[PDB]
Design a binder for this molecule. Structure first.
Ligand SMILES: O=c1[nH]cnc2c(Sc3cccc(Oc4c(F)c(F)c(F)c(F)c4F)c3/C=C/P(=O)(O)O)c[nH]c12
Ligand SMILES: O=c1[nH]cnc2c(Sc3cccc(Oc4c(F)c(F)c(F)c(F)c4F)c3/C=C/P(=O)(O)O)c[nH]c12
Ligand SMILES: O=c1[nH]cnc2c(Sc3cccc(Oc4c(F)c(F)c(F)c(F)c4F)c3/C=C/P(=O)(O)O)c[nH]c12
Ligand code: NA
Ligand code: NA
Ligand code: NA
Lengths: 281, 281, 281
């Protein structure tokens, strides 16, 4: 739906309107977006102001790019992200990631909320993403579907190495270098489209396929980032333990997700700020 | 594709054209639709007569709403239902369920044919639906995809409690209260899009994911029903045992499905009639 | 997107423009398409020249039908095939198969490249397709989706018998009747949409579902072939072993796929030429 010149046009317009030249793109998950308050020399653009940039549908909170410095790194932050369940085609969801590349961004940090499928996980845990299962991708919902532009990347990119080995180590280390009672989790994120929450039978399916966490975002952005050669790091805030048996009378709800998001707020701003120092130049 | 005012407009037109005020919506599976003959004060509307109502594609049998009384309950019955495989988007397939809600319907009974994946199941068995696996949903084929209307329900409804506990018990009981040689089955229904029948490798996949029965309907209607707060009960007529090995020279066919449907006809009209008395007011 | 008269119009135009009356359709996988050089009385049509025929997107190699004789059989060969990942809807991908039927073709041979999921498989192996797993099909990406035309086939065709028993035997035999050090493999092909290569977690999923090989084609053509009653035989050239662990520093690439394709070239031209003699009349 976008031409190469649409991305270039959007990129140049952003370059013309900020002296900020970002290196790291950060995509904040639902209610982990207070992290814009830690930026310095913060310059804000509402999505509506940016050519070709999809406008958000959520009336409560309209999204924005915030350019700034986080702990030494020249950052662009996406507050309010796009999801399949809102009805965006994946070429709109992942439109920002290609703009970031053309701004000169070389690293993407992606964060999300997720339900715990791994029994060991607890509400409030952070799981680093070692790998993903792209269920939409298997069926044709891949953001690379359509003509490939060699200026962005190959027709057939690999994803076996999607989540940077170096950054995962340098994040386990960084987590030791704090006084955290609870250990830092690591695992496979499965993307489902949503927006409804899984049945018990569905949760059992996702456990058997070997997923540790389930969410409704991230994987499309990761594929497009890797397609054009960005280094990728990400993690999940476990907001809830997915109901895996028919005895329980507890039900997943977005209130849970927000609540866990407010509790983990300070911890996450800290973790992501310190991590900037571990990203090369 | 529909606005809130399209559903309201359709609802009011139906209210203006019948004195019937239904409480229970019943969606009859392929050849379980003789059950309209058990209604009293039956008033029939062809889909074509009803504003905004998708017309059926099947030339042989065009669908209709029948309003009437079944065993004390004010019912609306859907004879002829929509399937993904016919090329309807899921917002058309599940358009009726939202109209039912606005008519004042508070309960949905959904019935379907299905192939047996559980080896214990036999042709002619009835399986109550305890749970579903929404394979289309994982990939983006969820009827809630798009802008959410708070007047219908939440952005992120749970489905872990989709199939009413009370009604499943009150249906096992009701089945005892008859002279049935064969025991009443209970299990997970997996929706696939069809319209072609599964390979042996596919059948093995669906067994490993933990499905008991496989069909091509129902799950989208259930999600939209739950989204706007209807109580949901359903079951499958097992029409065939899915070929699970390469030795067999038997092939699934729609003739099997119809045939099993004619045999189970009297049993199903009876079962669903008696069940009306167990639905609250 | 096509009417019955579009296929008939394309068929008749091909009949009007060649005296060749083909019996066997062959769809050549990526770089197994030198096999057009073994035809005799070869008559070539570029896709662009053929009414209603999708034009290829690949600038390097534009596709063509080659009518000719291979080892006694009146053949039509498709060099350059369509894939979901290029953005074709499945009714375009499988448009040729319906034209073949109306030309009088009664047999389809389909070949593809694939990644090895079965640990026993080695780069350069040939796997006969006993069965498939249609992951896109489960979610709604089935080329039969939409109104069914009884002139092509049934609304609800079976696929449990998709890959001809007789031809698989007559191909194992044919392989003995050569001096091949390496044994001929047999297994389940899983179709995924691509075009990106699987993660380790994804590879593990496809192993657990019981797939031996993974590719991005073939299954839609097979379904439409069976729908209109063609006999179907096919195999995969194993071009690579899918990365199934996080230790490895090897990554799948399309260069691997091409390379394996050049090595297996002579072996495959031979195998498919000899197989013609085993196809009835
Ligand atoms: O058990 C589970 N199954 C499947 N998925 C999940 C998720 S993810 C998720 C679920 C519901 C709402 C969510 O977020 C919003 C929001 F997007 C809203 F717009 C909103 F208004 C809100 F209140 C939310 F909670 C998110 C986050 C989305 P992210 O962008 O971080 O990937 C958490 N738990 C589960
Ligand atoms: O092994 C199996 N695999 C996968 N699916 C199944 C089903 S479901 C199904 C399969 C073929 C035709 C069917 O029904 C029609 C019809 F819809 C027709 F229009 C028609 F003309 C006819 F003859 C049928 F049998 C249905 C019912 C559909 P329902 O609405 O009850 O959910 C039964 N067995 C299997
Ligand atoms: O581990 C794996 N995972 C998933 N899939 C595979 C495949 S299939 C495949 C992967 C990449 C490119 C491919 O082929 C082209 C091409 F289609 C091109 F257009 C091209 F230019 C080229 F260089 C190729 F290699 C094909 C063949 C396609 P076929 O039509 O034979 O089914 C091989 N290995 C794996
Ligand atoms: Na351009
Ligand atoms: Na309106
Ligand atoms: Na016509």
């Amino acid at each position: 739906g976008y031409t190469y010149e649409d991305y270039k046009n959007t990129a140049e317009w952003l370059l013309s309107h900020t002296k900020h030249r970002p290196q790291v793109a950060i995509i904040c998950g639902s209610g982990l977006g207070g992290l814009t308050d830690k930026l310095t020399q913060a310059q804000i653009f509402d999505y509506g102001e940016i050519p070709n940039f999809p406008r958000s549908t959520v009336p409560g909170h309209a999204g924005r790019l915030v350019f700034g410095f986080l702990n030494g790194r020249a950052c662009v932050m996406m507050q309010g992200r796009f999801h399949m369940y809102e009805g965006y085609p994946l070429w709109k969801v992942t439109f920002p990631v290609r703009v970031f590349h053309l701004l000169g961004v070389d690293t993407l940090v992606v964060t999300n909320a997720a339900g715990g499928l791994n029994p060991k996980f607890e509400v409030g845990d952070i799981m680093l993403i070692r790998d993903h299962i792209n269920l939409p991708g298997f069926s044709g919902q891949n953001p690379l579907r359509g003509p490939n532009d060699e200026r962005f990347g190959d027709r057939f990119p690999a994803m076996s190495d999607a989540y940077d080995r170096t950054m995962r180590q340098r994040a386990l280390s960084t987590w030791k270098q704090m006084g955290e009672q609870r250990e830092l989790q690591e695992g496979t994120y499965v993307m489902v489209a949503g927006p409804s929450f899984e049945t018990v039978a569905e949760c059992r399916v996702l456990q058997k396929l070997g997923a540790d966490a389930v969410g409704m975002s991230t994987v499309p952005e990761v594929i497009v980032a890797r397609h054009c050669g960005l280094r990728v790091f990400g993690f999940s805030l476990i907001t809830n333990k997915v109901i895996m048996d028919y005895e329980s009378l507890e039900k997943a709800n977005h209130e849970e997700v927000l609540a866990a998001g407010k509790q983990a707020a300070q911890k996450l701003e800290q973790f992501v700020s310190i991590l900037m120092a571990s990203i090369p130049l």
